[PDB]
Amino acid sequence: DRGVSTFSPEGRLFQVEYSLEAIKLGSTAIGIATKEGVVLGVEKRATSPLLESDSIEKIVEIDRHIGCAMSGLTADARSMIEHARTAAVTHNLYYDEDINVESLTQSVCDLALRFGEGASGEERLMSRPFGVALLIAGHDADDGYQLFHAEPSGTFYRYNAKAIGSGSEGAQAELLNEWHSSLTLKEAELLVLKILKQVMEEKLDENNAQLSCITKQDGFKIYDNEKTAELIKELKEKEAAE
Amino acid sequence: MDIILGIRVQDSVILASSKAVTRGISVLKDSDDKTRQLSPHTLMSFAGEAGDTVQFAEYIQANIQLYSIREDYELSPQAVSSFVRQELAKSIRSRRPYQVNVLIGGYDKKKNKPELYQIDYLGTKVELPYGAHGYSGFYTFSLLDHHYRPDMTTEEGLDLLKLCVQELEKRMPMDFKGVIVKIVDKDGIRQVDDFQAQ
Amino acid sequence: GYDRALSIFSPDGHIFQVEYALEAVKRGTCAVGVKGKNCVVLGCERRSTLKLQDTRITPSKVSKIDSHVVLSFSGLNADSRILIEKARVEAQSHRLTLEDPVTVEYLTRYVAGVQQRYTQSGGVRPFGVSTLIAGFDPRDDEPKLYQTEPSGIYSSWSAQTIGRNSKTVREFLEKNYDRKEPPATVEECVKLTVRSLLEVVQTGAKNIEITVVKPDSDIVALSSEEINQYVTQIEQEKQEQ
Amino acid sequence: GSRRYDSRTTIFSPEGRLYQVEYALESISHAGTAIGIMASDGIVLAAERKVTSTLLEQDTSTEKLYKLNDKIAVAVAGLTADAEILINTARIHAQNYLKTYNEDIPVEILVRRLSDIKQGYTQHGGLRPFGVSFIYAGYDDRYGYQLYTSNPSGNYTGWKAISVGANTSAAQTLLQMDYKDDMKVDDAIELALKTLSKTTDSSALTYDRLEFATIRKGANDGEVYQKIFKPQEIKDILVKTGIT
Amino acid sequence: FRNNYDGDTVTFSPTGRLFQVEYALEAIKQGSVTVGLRSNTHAVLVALKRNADELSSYQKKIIKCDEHMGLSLAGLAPDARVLSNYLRQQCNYSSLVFNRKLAVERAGHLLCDKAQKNTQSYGGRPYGVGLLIIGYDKSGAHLLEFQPSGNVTELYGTAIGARSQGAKTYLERTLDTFIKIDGNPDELIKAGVEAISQSLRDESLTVDNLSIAIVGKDTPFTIYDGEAVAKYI
Amino acid sequence: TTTLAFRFQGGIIVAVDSRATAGNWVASQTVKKVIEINPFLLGTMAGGAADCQFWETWLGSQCRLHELREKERISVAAASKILSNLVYQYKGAGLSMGTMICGYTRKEGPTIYYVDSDGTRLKGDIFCVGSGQTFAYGVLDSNYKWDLSVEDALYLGKRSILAAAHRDAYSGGSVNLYHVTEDGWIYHGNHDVGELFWKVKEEEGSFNNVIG
Amino acid sequence: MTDRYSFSLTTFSPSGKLGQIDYALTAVKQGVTSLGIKATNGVVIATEKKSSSPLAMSETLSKVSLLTPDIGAVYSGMGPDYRVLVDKSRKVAHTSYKRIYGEYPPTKLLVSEVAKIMQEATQSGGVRPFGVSLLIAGHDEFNGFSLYQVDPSGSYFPWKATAIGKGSVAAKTFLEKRWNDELELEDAIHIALLTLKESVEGEFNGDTIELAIIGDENPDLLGYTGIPTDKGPRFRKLTSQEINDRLEAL
Amino acid sequence: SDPSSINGGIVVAMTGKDCVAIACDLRLGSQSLGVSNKFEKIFHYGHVFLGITGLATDVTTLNEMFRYKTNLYKLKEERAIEPETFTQLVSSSLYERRFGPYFVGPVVAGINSKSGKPFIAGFDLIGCIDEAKDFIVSGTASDQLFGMCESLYEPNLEPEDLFETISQALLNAADRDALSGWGAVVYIIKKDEVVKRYLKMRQD
Ligand SMILES: */C1=C\C(=O)NCC[C@H](O)C[C@H](NC(=O)[C@@H](NC(=O)/C=C/C=C/CCCCCCC)[C@@H](C)O)C(=O)N[C@H]1C
């Protein structure tokens, strides 16, 4: 056929590219950073009414000051999460200190290109690349609140706001205009909730959507349905307001 | 050593096991249960080295429970005792052997008879009317050699036991803090919570 | 030795071997699970391409991972055994190391992981199986129903079905099960399950097998009669109109 | 590299099927027919010897009926060579079970292990599956008489009557037409012979083209017995069932 | 043609080419421009950091390998990590074992051989990054250009990446001038920034867009970003 | 070293000394023999210092990882078995540690587990481990009642260590107290044996032998 | 390096055939004829020494080989494949039997071993099946004399008599006619020489025919004396001279 | 300390007229303590008998092993194994563990089904074979058995006489050994039948 680690004439790795396609087909995930914390939002997207919507975990905790959101083939994210968590707890065991958000990110990205059928660089055993992207958000004493985008390519960027998934291209455009260095956590909460509503095929409610955030004071917390439902209501109102 | 006794009467097997756990100069516990249930009708008492003892029993437990789940059937005592003798016979010639001696007592629901098995860390297995590990045998075998009968009832057997536990408290150096007794029969495994004065 | 990457990405971002694994699931017999208010019931259909089988011995579709958790499937039979065995061992191991039997959610997440792993490990094809795992956590009475698939994804359901014509029976359940008021009885919970299977089993008293799981390791598999009876009573429901 | 010549014997078809398994079954379909009929007091195994000659030594031959244990036997359909590799590992598994538990291996336990081995070649290794299907006929004290069947896929199931190899559709129908639960061993023996006699691609059904085995519990003993018939034995029973 | 000979690196085309390696080289041209130039006292790197959105950040292009050596990249960032990290170990091994600073010329030889291994065995893939390594060792300042093919070359200056030819020509022209900027880093850095702006087009180099690295006689390889590069834009 | 822990109405009391020796040489009088595994778990240090301090910190990491993974605080019975199994993997290698894993889970209530490098894991109400264990047992054993006030129980602990610090040459320095409730444990100060001894003597009239 | 052919080179075709085993058998068909006949007190196996140049010395080569003192082999197909199989066969007879029971294996079992070798060459990774078929003849105390044929597929079966290779079809028919269950060894040797004559184009003498018999114990071929139970090998290859003398009574 | 002297026990085999006998005690102890009086040391696989003295755990292990082997042997060879062959199997099985042997002393007895000839043989712990035509001894009281046999024994005894002789050798030998006794069993083997008798002896 054609090796999993082959280069395209344009200088790209086929598997990685195709990997990015599967991601576009993934649920929406948005992240907004503010000097008051970072907000992460995801589209549950239930394939049926019988499916208990809250058994859908697309936002997980890495550590008390680090959480992430996933988009794309999510079963793939499992081992990335385990690694990220171990890396965070381990760094603590060895340095008696919290792991910096960027380093945690950089750590996950290091697994990314570890694939092939005999790549002459070490012992990269994993048949294909990961088919999921991640939004990593947290806070640390060195660079405060941070949002990161980690891809199956093995690279990562830092964003003030970023959306990945099926509605990304448009949602990102929204953020481009909406975001500003003075947003408050609440503002960002409604903004995330609003963009999810626009791009979602379904009617946004506290059951097919989910919020959460990271604040230096209480760390990473995932909003329970009630807290969210209200923010949704408060959003509909201010919208009809004009 | 610890007190590990076993007696097979007419329709059940009785297992007595010292409750003390001493470490050097101090007796750390007086309510220790040196036993593990392998299946609804199979119980195994054990005594030996500090870590090996529990690690082996639980390991054997896990495997027999797995066989039960996988086969949706309960292995006969005889078979369970054969699996255990094998595990120890492997251990004996391994890098760091398990120093654990065990008594296996169970009720064969198919033959409808109780069975008692004595197995030592070497993998020595023997089937007996009554048996014991450690020094206990030294004062109890003659008692039982004298007063034992195959058709005794569970009650008769429980008395013969009290007789043994008495001789042991009289002539044995160590204070083993009494014993915990258990009966295994057609209906399963139950503990005689009233022997501290039965 | 052999480590060819069999599950890989295609231009449109799809892992075909995993998708084809799903197709194998669609072909397998049907399986269903509905959780009541104090129990969970699993029902599976039995093929009829041949009949002269000895049901006594022939391996049944609902397996026990432990004494409080069961697992049924749809897909390749051979492949289910590998998964069942692995989960069974994990069940005992977890008891040993944590001194506490696996929760249904956990045992499920483990099985899902095995599947996901087989989708990005060289030299192996994904499992042509999807599963339904149900039971009650230790010292808990709230019923648990979970589903897993080749991709490695899993989630919980109030009721769900997998296998051939699962499209049908799911529709049936979607408009016959109210989360507000779940089959408050073991009895009416077993009924909703037979009803749902009859939508596709096409008269098969001996072609349907049920298994009810109640809190505290109370699992039992109904016999033809107990089932046949449920079928009888249901056919009158239709005629009486 | 070598990826060029790799048949990928372990992947799914777009229809969710395993090519190799499918094709291997296609292979088995041209194999001599084998039937297993389970009566109330025993089990019967019969198979048709594919390709024979005047010169073929039949007294020393055995190409379909193999003894695994003292209470378990199998009829084969597919590659004899492949069958043996598996037959031997089964005979060993049987003995290990004994050595460990000091009890004879339950018929289903032996069947499952053998089927797991096949399943393996189906999921990893880049190797071809075993072109073989088995009809296991054994007895144990936990389920008594049992009849099982396993194929290249690694799946196995239980049966009252069943056949594998060539003309199975025809054989199954004929069996499905005259099999009765209250059957007796000799009844099964006859149904067996007759079924073959009608599916045979040959002119007539002679003893020299057959293999026969029965697992009965001779009353005047109390123990189950395996008996693999000798040429002169099949010849007798052949005349009696009225096929001369 | 080419389609039958580019499926992997263990195949030669009928004209003796290794396409997989050539496609790798392509990844570099697609990468952001970066320039390197030296004198007899200092060696400089200037890079144009690229960004995703305007809400994102500008990915780092320069990595420090030791107190006397470092490099800038163009291409697959992950690979630069792998390679610079390998170069760090080699620098480290030389210190620990021989209490000796790894010579730039040797670092280059090490890189070359590592890259090469991935172009002759089945299963591997060439690296998709280009590197410009500067450093000050026992024989002065040095500048190396590393290509995925395995070819490492020592130059006075050079540039790699999209529109690099602009800067390369400017240097090729200014040669006799900058090669003599001794005892004055700020000047060599300017000649650096000028050469790189010769490859601009899209935009103009800003403060959080430009990136400078400098190593030399009494200068431990240090990096400059943002406000730090202000006095050069 | 003297460390004790007992269960009672008010939950669990944990007391330890802080003397570290190397032969007859007193290395430290300021050692922390209570490892704070987390807001609900406590570990005691007896036997080899590094062996306890290290492997117990390690246990903490393992517990944290379990909670992230299971979204549920680890049980005391399980945290004790992780330490237990780890240590048994090294049986024979020479590790030296006698420890108590203490905690309060809604599911088990107050629980104490004894864990030594021998592979021994025991659940119980009262445990004294260390070279001064018998001296604490003496005091503790004869003044224990499930019905002790959280205040009287706290004192019995402090005093049981004082007893051991006196007689045992390898124990001493200061006393460290902990109170285990479900909301977690509560530190109850560091009590320099230097002063605590005199104080108790005067106020209690005990240690009558010593000349004051 | 490193054999990257860890997958099967012999797989199933949609029709259900195993190509390589088929092609392998085709190669057996092309090979020189060789046959075997079981008498009441012996077995005989023979083939034709088809010299591949008058400059080549066909004596420096054996198509009929000794496996154990009571088992001989012969083939049809690819010479080099037979050669390595003979070595492997002799070894396995030791490693898996003589070294355990202190006695040479019985025909069926040794034959069973060879079969296993070939079967694996049918499924193992990166290899092709063996392009030969063997006619193994031998004798053991509890089974008497026997003759087996082993195919590249790894299958094998017992024969009263049979032939393989080029003129096998013709030869088989001729044998089915002459064979009976009362033949003495000499008779079979004669019949053998006859059957062989048809398949032989050119010369037919003791220097172009290779034949061996599994008959009585040759104490004279032991090499030592003084051990009652050791009676000598039953396998004996005939000499050029021995052949001709019979070719006259042909 | 000495493995071959932890459990105790003895075995002896004799040949008579068209017959062979093999006998053993029933003791199984742990040093001075007697534990079981039902531990038999004779087993058989088909018409072949095997006595095993030594460390009990190994006595059990080897029995399970030879069962396993003789079973597969019959399945492949399609006949029961003979005494002579079995001897070779035992020997190589033991030498297989040359540098960490089973602490046992095996004794083989049987009549060759095909030749009708009686056969007995002994082995040391690493497989060395001793094939006598009169008698083989083994166990903690082997010195005694040697004195007993070397005297009592005579060729071609009848099954009824050989019984007396092998029983007398066993009994009196066991009575001078603290680690042997507590019962005994004797097997008399003829080409057609096998008789197993239990003996009456001291229990001290
Ligand atoms: C409790 C005291 C106790 O319960 N028992 C007394 C014995 C106990 O093991 C002593 C322990 N002391 C230490 O851990 C000390 N550290 C060491 O002993 C380190 C030893 C290293 C040995 C390897 C050889 C090194 C040679 C170096 C030459 C320069 C103190 C200092 O930590 C102890 O006090 N335990 C207390 C908690």
C2, C4, C125, best to mutate vs chain G, most G CBs in 10 Å: C2
| Tokens 């005629």 -> residue | C239
Tell me if C172 sits within 8 A of C195, measured CB to CB: yes
Q: Give the range of the structural domain holding residue G177, as residue numbers without chain letter.
A: 1-250
Give which of B179, B183, B194 is closest to B34, Cα–Cα.
B179
For A144: left if phi > 0, alpha if psi spans -120 to 50, otherwise beta; the answer is left
Count of structural domains, chain G? 1
Token pair of C202, please?
Answer: 């096409």
With 0-12 CB in 10 A as exposed, 13-18 as middle and 19+ as buried, what is H153?
middle
Count of structural domains, chain E? 1
Count of structural domains, chain B? 1
**Inter-CA distances, F163 with A135, A240, F177, Å:** 58, 75, 15
B51/F118 touch (CB, cutoff 8 Å), yes or no: yes
Nearest Cα residue to atom 5 of ligand 1: F47
Count of residues in chain C:
241
Token pair of G94, please?
Answer: 């030791």
Q: Give the range of the structural domain holding residue F194, as residue numbers without chain letter.
A: 1-212
Q: How far is the CA of F96 from the centre of ligand 1 (A)?
A: 10
A85/F65 touch (CB, cutoff 8 Å), yes or no: yes
User: Distance between CA atoms of C128 and C61, rounded to whole angstroms?
Assistant: 15
* Nearest chain C CA: its distance from A4 CA (Å): 7
Token pair of E40, please?
Answer: 């007899």
Q: How many CB atoms lie within 10 A of CB G245?
A: 11
* Nearest chain C CA: its distance from A74 CA (Å): 7
Q: How far is the CA of C102 from the centre of ligand 1 (A)?
A: 41
**C-alpha dihedral (A212, A218, A224, A230), degrees to nearest 10:** -80
With 0-12 CB in 10 A as exposed, 13-18 as middle and 19+ as buried, what is B110?
exposed
D27/G17 touch (CB, cutoff 8 Å), yes or no: yes
Tell me if F108 sits within 8 A of F182, measured CB to CB: no
Tell me if D34 sits within 8 A of D64, measured CB to CB: yes
* Nearest chain A CA: its distance from E220 CA (Å): 24
Q: A-side interface with D, Cβ within 8 Å?
A: 1, 3, 117
Say if residue F49 carries a ligand binding annotation: yes
Tell me if A65 sits within 8 A of A111, measured CB to CB: no
Tell me if D27 sits within 8 A of D152, measured CB to CB: no
Q: In what order do the strands lie in the sheet with D144-150?
A: D65-67, D72-78, D132-140, D144-150, D156-158
Token pair of F120, please?
Answer: 């021994």
User: Distance between CA atoms of D112 and G157, rounded to whole angstroms?
Assistant: 30
Burial string for E3-25 (b: 16+ CB within 10 Å, else e) reads eebbbbbeeeeeeeebbbbbbbb
Give which of H18, H24, H77 is closest to H46, Cα–Cα.
H77
Give which of B61, F69, B80, B190 is closest to C99, Cα–Cα.
B61
Q: What domains, with CATH codes, occur in chain D?
A: 1-244 (3.60.20.10)
Nearest Cα residue to atom 17 of ligand 1: F22
User: Distance between CA atoms of D131 and D149, rounded to whole angstroms?
Assistant: 14
The answer to whether F61 faces chain A, any CB pair under 8 Å, is yes
| Tokens 């609440």 -> residue | A186
H55/B128 touch (CB, cutoff 8 Å), yes or no: no
Which other chains touch chain H, taking contact as 3+ CB pairs less than 8 Å apart? Answer: B, D, G
Tell me if H107 sits within 8 A of H11, measured CB to CB: yes
F68/A90 touch (CB, cutoff 8 Å), yes or no: no
Q: How far is the CA of F21 from the centre of ligand 1 (A)?
A: 6
Count of residues in chain B:
198
Give which of A135, A141, A159 is closest to A34, Cα–Cα.
A159
SS (H, E, C) chain G: CCCCCCCECCCCCCCCCCHHHHHHHHHHHHCCCEEEEECCCCEEEEEECCCCCCCCCCCCCCCCEEEECCEEEEEEECHHHHHHHHHHHHHHHHHHHHHHHCCCCCHHHHHHHHHHHHHHCCCCECCCCCCEEEEEEEEECCCEEEEEEECCCCCEEEECEEEECCCHHHHHHHHHHHCCCCCCHHHHHHHHHHHHHHHCCCCCCCCCEEEEEECCCCHHHCCCCCCCCCCCCCEEECCHHHHHHHHHCC
A92/F61 touch (CB, cutoff 8 Å), yes or no: yes
In chain A, which ranges are continuous DSSP H helix? 14-24, 77-95, 101-112, 168-178, 185-199, 225-240
Q: How far is the CA of F26 from the centre of ligand 1 (A)?
A: 10
H68, H74, H76, H77, best to mutate vs chain G, most G CBs in 10 Å: H77
What is the greatest pairwise CA distance in chain H? Answer: 47
User: Distance between CA atoms of C96 and B57, rounded to whole angstroms?
Assistant: 11
Q: How far is the CA of F49 from the centre of ligand 1 (A)?
A: 6
Instruction: Assign residue B99 the CATH number of its domain.
Output: 3.60.20.10
Q: Where are the domains of chain C?
A: 1-241
Q: How many CB atoms lie within 10 A of CB G176?
A: 14
Strand, coil or helix: what is A225? helix
Token pair of H176, please?
Answer: 């001078």
- Tell me how many residue pairs between chain B and chain D have CB atoms under 8 A apart: 19
Q: What domains, with CATH codes, occur in chain H?
A: 1-204 (3.60.20.10)
Burial string for D53-81 (b: 16+ CB within 10 Å, else e) reads bebbbbebbbbbbbbbbbbbbbbbbbbbb
Nearest Cα residue to atom 11 of ligand 1: F48
A85/F68 touch (CB, cutoff 8 Å), yes or no: yes
Count of residues in chain F:
212
Give which of A121, A49, A130 is closest to A83, Cα–Cα.
A130
Q: What is the DSSP letter of H135?
A: E
* CATH superfamily of this structure's domain A1-242: Aminohydrolase, N-terminal nucleophile (Ntn) domain (3.60.20.10)
DSSP D64-92: SEEE-SSSEEEEEEE-HHHHHHHHHHHHH
Strand, coil or helix: what is D141? coil
Q: Give the range of the structural domain holding residue E194, as residue numbers without chain letter.
A: 1-233
Burial string for E44-74 (b: 16+ CB within 10 Å, else e) reads bbbbbbbebbebbbbbebbbbbbbbbbbbbb
Tell me if B121 sits within 8 A of B88, measured CB to CB: yes
C14, C46, C54, C81, best to mutate vs chain D, most D CBs in 10 Å: C54
Token pair of F124, please?
Answer: 């119980």
Contacts of A62 in chain F (CB under 8 A): 68
Nearest CB neighbour to B124, from listed H33, H56, H100: H56
Q: How many CA atoms lie within 13 A of G210 on its CB side?
A: 22
Give which of E90, E33, E25, E26 is closest to E61, Cα–Cα.
E33
**Inter-CA distances, D187 with D162, D196, D213, D218, E152, Å:** 15, 15, 14, 16, 87
Residues with CB under 6 A from ligand 1: F 1, 20-22, 27, 33, 45-49, 96, 130-131, 170
**Inter-CA distances, G98 with F31, G92, G223, G227, H73, Å:** 70, 9, 20, 18, 14
User: Distance between CA atoms of D116 and C4, rounded to whole angstroms?
Assistant: 22
With 0-12 CB in 10 A as exposed, 13-18 as middle and 19+ as buried, what is H187?
buried
Q: Domain C1-241's class?
A: alpha beta
At residue E159, φ and ψ (nearest 5 deg) are -150, 150
| Residue F181 annotated in active site | no
Contacts for F58 with CB less than 8 Å, ≥ 6 apart: A93, F86
Token pair of E229, please?
Answer: 């590069």
Question: Which amino acid makes up residue D203?
Answer: S
Q: Inspect the structure and tell me whether chains G and H have 3 or more CB pairs less than 8 Å apart.
A: yes
Tell me if D205 sits within 8 A of D193, measured CB to CB: yes
* Percentages (nearest 5) of helix, strand, coil residues in chain A: 35, 25, 40
In chain E, which ranges are continuous DSSP H helix? 19-29, 77-98, 104-117, 164-178, 185-197
DSSP E107-127: HHHHHHHHHHHTTTSTT----
Cα dihedral sign, F69-F73-F75-F76: positive
Q: How far is the CA of F48 from the centre of ligand 1 (A)?
A: 6
Tell me if D166 sits within 8 A of D33, measured CB to CB: yes
Strand, coil or helix: what is A218? coil
- The catalytic residue among F1, F3, F105, F111 is F1
Burial string for C79-113 (b: 16+ CB within 10 Å, else e) reads bbbbbbbebbbbbbebbbebeebbbbbbbbbbbbb
* Nearest chain F CA: its distance from B127 CA (Å): 30
Count of structural domains, chain F? 1
Nearest Cα residue to atom 14 of ligand 1: F49
Token pair of D231, please?
Answer: 């040429």
Strand, coil or helix: what is C17? helix
Nearest Cα residue to atom 18 of ligand 1: F22
Instruction: Assign residue G144 the CATH number of its domain.
Output: 3.60.20.10
Q: How many CB atoms lie within 10 A of CB H47?
A: 16
Resolution in A: 2.7
Q: How many CB atoms lie within 10 A of CB H108?
A: 26
Technique used to solve these coordinates: X-ray
Question: Which amino acid makes up residue H139?
Answer: G
Strand, coil or helix: what is H117? coil
User: Distance between CA atoms of D192 and D34, rounded to whole angstroms?
Assistant: 9
Give which of G124, G111, G90, G114 is closest to G20, Cα–Cα.
G124
